[PDB]
Design a binder for this molecule. Sequence first.
Ligand code: XCZ
Ligand code: NA
Ligand code: ZN
Length: 258
Amino acid sequence: HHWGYGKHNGPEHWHKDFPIAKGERQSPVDIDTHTAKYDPSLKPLSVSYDQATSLRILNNGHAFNVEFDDSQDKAVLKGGPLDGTYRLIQFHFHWGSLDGQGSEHTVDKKKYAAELHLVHWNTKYGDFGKAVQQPDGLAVLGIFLKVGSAKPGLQKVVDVLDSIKTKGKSADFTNFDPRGLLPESLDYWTYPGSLTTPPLLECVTWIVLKEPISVSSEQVLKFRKLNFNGEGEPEELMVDNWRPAQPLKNRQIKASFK
Ligand SMILES: Cc1ccnc(S(N)(=O)=O)n1
Ligand code: NA
Ligand SMILES: [Zn+2]
């Protein structure tokens, strides 16, 4: 497969190799704040990252992933809309070529400069590859980025990107604390959806925080110096690696807050 984000292989093309691209529960979606209903049934959200063990950062040709040790329940997401325990496996971002675009989810059609996805899998399925075959197999926590003041807890990430400029490069990335990437509030919207890149599997409970984090222009400029291409190949800057909003269809977005 040769999917990407260019004119010739971008989101409009994905359906030809991944027909679930036109399915009933695809992501991302526009969050219409005046249609999402407060749900008093939602239990509170529990982000338990104290014991998180980051290992490595990888440029995979689509984004970069910060990978975690998910061999035990070290860093988990529970509560909110979720049953059971969801283990953190990696985080990554989607971002734009300019500050006016980059996020996958939108909020009343507003696009943010970027979007962070913390990916977790349901431990009742034993491994990630089994989890993605289940309608409740993954929980992705999504967090918007806006450009303003610098985010200190991001700087370790931006400072390693020079070392993984091209597709297939990785670097050691131990002792990184993903708590530094959260906003103050855990207020959120939630809906059932999918992975936003191929294979586009319909296995995700989306939890999208209301409060964006602020990052500096200098920080996001450094994201945009990454490459989609491999070493020695003609430079294609890693920008605009986001899928646009998909049809909501027969789904309801719930709010944890009034
Ligand atoms: C791990 C993975 C694969 C595909 N898509 C995603 S995403 N962008 O829905 O978080 N994560
Ligand atoms: Na892993
Ligand atoms: Zn993502």
